[PDB]
Design a protein around this nucleic acid. Structure first.
Lengths: 484, 205
RNA sequence: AGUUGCUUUGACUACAAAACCAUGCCUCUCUCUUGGAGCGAAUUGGAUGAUCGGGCCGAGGGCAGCGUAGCGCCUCUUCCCCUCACUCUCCUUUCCCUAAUAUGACUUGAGUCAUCAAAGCCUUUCUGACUCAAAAAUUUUUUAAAAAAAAAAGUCGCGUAUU
């Protein structure tokens, strides 16, 4: 056709790729390593691509959080001769801020030419400010835009409102919506969504009934399932049930594209309400919308079923996931691991722990956290020590460090008080020392008295000055300076 | 154990593509209803508990390999309906008498199931094939005669509690050119026939 | 001195949607590419009941030819296929509607804009996966010791009975 001459089916195979780039980069999987390997193999080749092909590739790589390969492809293909326009420069600015940080994004914006510093680049930098929560520089961009008469779109106002909601100054939203209505700016559905969220955050449930009637009066915005998701979340957190069911049934009517996240929202909202029959009603629709169901829907479903106490249904779902799983997801195991430790059927939890790494799932930290929860409920402390050591050795799955909860630490130390396990208390303190540099809220401030078994340590209040100036209760130093 | 229990799952989406997708999963569509819905008169079409079902492939095939194919419409089962697969909660329960399977003539895979509720005291018509026992010991068969299979099924009308899954006769006492009528067939005295028996046997040598 | 290299190579498609509350352990743990659940229709279905018509098997007495068993003619209705009502729960062929199919809706009229060391090699060094070397672990065999080995699941088929 004359509309689209650069067709991807009829194009030459000697010059161009045999399959589209957004199909080629995802051949070996969606993993970071496989995407990087595919990009490295492609950039060394002698086959070429289209500009719209690279644009859709950038959007697909951005849509799954793959920011480094998207930035690398954009930089290399611009270096090879593909000229960025203003829109492509806005997308590249957002990609730079996503990958190398806002300090790199600011330098890219400065090094941009002057005729490229238009409303698209300004709005992209504003969004990259609000997503990184820098209120002062945000407002410094805002008054500069208002001074230079750059057209402020609804996207910028929604970005500021989401920034206000996340920072905690959520009372500014009702002033700002009337500001953007006074400045002749029509809103979108996300404007009503953040307005509703700020109104519910202001402890005002009765205000969300006058906004829905106003957008019904407007007649210009299309209501979407995200609106009803916000209504369902606000009502379920507020305890109202029938209005939440009406919102969720309207949500089910609005989900015409069979969205996986929307189905997850139905499942978790009906699970938090507690209605098992309609939970299974949406679940059968989910199995009718995707036969090869991913592990995320199982992760939601089995957690909902065990929070609604359907344990043999969860056990049959486990066998279904076993017989149809391609990746042995450890979180699926770890849901019923914590289930079997909470209801105490510990032999089957131990069997799953043994059989997971053979089938191909290595243990993360939360399984050991649930087992030390089990051991701190049943009073065995040595096995809680053996669990917390392996938990801090594994650490977090995103590169963080695992730290035990304050309530569990407090209960474990109260258990240490009775048995006079000074060695156990010292090992727990050493573990917390390795975990964190601070180590103290209630950890040892009133907990010198575990030394009241036989003698005490040497330093006499000088060790307690070492760990960054802690302060103890007034009724704690008396048995300390009695024993000197 | 005496009778079989059939676990079922409800249905809400009906159609050819949805049925083929349920069979892609391995679930077979089905229905359950009382008999009063099947009457021609809407006056006798009363309060009908018509309901849609889906059935597990492994359980249906296990029952079929257990009991046999053409005897399926005679025997009764206990239907248990639950909200989800393997749920600890039940919706309803009862006894049912099947009348219809759907199977493709190529591979024989089960395609549809038709189920009729069989509550206490319900009078239902049924077509039961008969079973001949004592073949190897029949003196007419041993001496040179042959047992001609005349009639296959008989019509029975009676309670849901006491319908036999199979009809047995004794043919070990027949010499050659001997026949046994349908009135000599061992069956329940409270059970009625509604069949044109007349001067016809079930078997003859 | 002669050959081969050094000798540039690309894009032009118009595109800010990158701002999200739920469960949250890195919640898409890896989704590239799937027709519809339209209250939508036409032939077909049929989970249903009889009439009319046609068509086997068969049941007796017999006219009929034997010491059991007959060949044509003669009284019969079950059973099947149609037909008229009820009829949407499985199946075949189509048609409409929706979704999807990469965005949006003259000046390369012989141009404008980028690129102008690519490809190798050798030292380090951060982080992942695999082969493992070998030991501790558990089973069998051999005489507490020495040799070899699986652990966890799905699928097909056979014979046989415990709610």
């Amino acid at each position: 056709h004359l509309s689209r001459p650069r067709d991807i089916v009829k194009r030459s195979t000697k010059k161009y790729l045999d399959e589209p780039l957004y199909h080629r980069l995802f051949k070996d999987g969606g993993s970071e390593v496989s995407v990087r390997q595919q990009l490295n193999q492609f950039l060394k080749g002698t086959k070429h691509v289209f500009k719209w092909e690279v644009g859709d590739t950038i959007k697909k790589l951005r849509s799954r959080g793959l920011y480094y390969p998207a930035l690398k492809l954009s930089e290399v293909m611009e270096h090879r001769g593909m000229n960025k326009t203003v829109s492509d420069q806005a997308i590249h600015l957002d990609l730079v801020a996503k990958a190398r940080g806002i300090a790199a994004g600011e330098s890219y914006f400065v090094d941009l030419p002057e005729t490229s510093k238009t409303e698209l680049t300004y709005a992209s930098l504003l969004n990259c400010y609000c997503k990184e929560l820098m209120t002062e520089k945000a407002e410094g961009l805002l008054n500069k835009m208002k001074e230079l008469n750059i057209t402020v779109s609804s996207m910028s106002y929604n970005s500021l409102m989401t920034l206000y909601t996340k920072t905690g100054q959520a009372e500014r939203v009702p002033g700002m919506i009337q500001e953007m209505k006074a400045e002749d700016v029509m809103p979108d559905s996300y404007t009503y969504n953040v307005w509703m969220r700020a109104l519910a955050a202001t402890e005002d449930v009765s205000g969300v009934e006058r906004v829905i009637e106003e957008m019904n009066r407007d007649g210009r915005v299309a209501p979407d399932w995200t609106t009803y998701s916000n209504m369902a979340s606000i009502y379920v957190d507020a305890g109202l049930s029938e209005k939440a069911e009406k919102a969720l049934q309207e949500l089910e009517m609005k989900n015409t594209d069979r969205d996986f996240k929307a189905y997850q929202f139905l499942i978790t909202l009906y699970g938090r309400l507690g209605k098992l029959n309609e939970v299974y009603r949406i679940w059968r629709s989910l199995r009718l919308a995707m036969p090869k169901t991913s592990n995320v829907a199982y992760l939601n479903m089995i957690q909902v079923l065990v929070n609604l106490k359907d344990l043999p249904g969860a056990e049959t779902l486990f066998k279904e996931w076993q017989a149809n799983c391609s990746t042995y997801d450890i979180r699926v195991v770890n849901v019923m691991i914590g289930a079997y430790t909470r209801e105490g059927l510990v032999e089957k939890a131990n069997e799953l722990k043994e059989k997971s790494p053979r089938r191909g799932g290595k243990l993360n930290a939360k399984t050991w956290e649930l087992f030390m929860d089990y051991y701190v409920k049943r009073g065995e402390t040595a096995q809680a020590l053996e669990c917390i050591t392996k938990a801090v050795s594994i650490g977090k799955g995103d590169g963080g460090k695992w730290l035990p909860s304050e309530d569990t630490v407090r209960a474990l130390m109260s258990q240490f008080e009775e048995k006079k396990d000074v060695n156990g208390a010292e090992s727990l303190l050493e573990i917390l020392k390795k975990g964190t540099d601070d180590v103290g809220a209630e950890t040892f401030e009133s907990l010198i008295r575990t030394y009241a078994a036989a003698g005490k340590s040497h330093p006499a209040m000088r060790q307690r000055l070492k760990m960054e100036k802690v302060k103890v209760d007034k009724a704690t130093e008396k048995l300390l300076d009695e024993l000197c | 154990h005496q009778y079989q229990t059939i676990q079922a799952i409800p249905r809400e989406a009906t159609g050819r593509g949805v049925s083929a997708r349920d069979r892609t999963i391995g679930r077979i569509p089905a229905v359950v209803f009382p008999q009063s819905l099947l009457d021609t008169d809407a006056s006798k079409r009363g309060v009908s508990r018509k309901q849609l079902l889906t059935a597990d492939k492994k359980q249906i095939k296990s029952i079929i390999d257990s009991v046999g194919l053409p005897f399926f419409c005679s025997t009764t089962f206990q239907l248990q309906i639950r909200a989800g697969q393997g749920s600890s909660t039940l919706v309803e329960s009862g006894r049912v008498l099947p009348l219809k399977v759907h199977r493709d003539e190529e591979t024989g895979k089960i395609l549809n199931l038709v189920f009729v509720w069989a509550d206490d005291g319900e009078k239902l018509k049924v077509d039961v094939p008969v079973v001949f026992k004592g073949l190897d010991h029949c003196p007419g068969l041993q001496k040179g005669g042959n047992l001609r299979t005349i009639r296959s099924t008989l019509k029975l009308l009676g309670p849901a509690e006491h319908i036999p899954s199979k009809i047995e006769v004794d043919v070990s006492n027949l010499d050659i050119e001997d026949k046994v009528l349908l009135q000599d067939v061992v069956f329940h005295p409270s059970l009625k026939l509604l069949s044109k028996n007349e001067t016809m046997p079930v078997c003859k040598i």
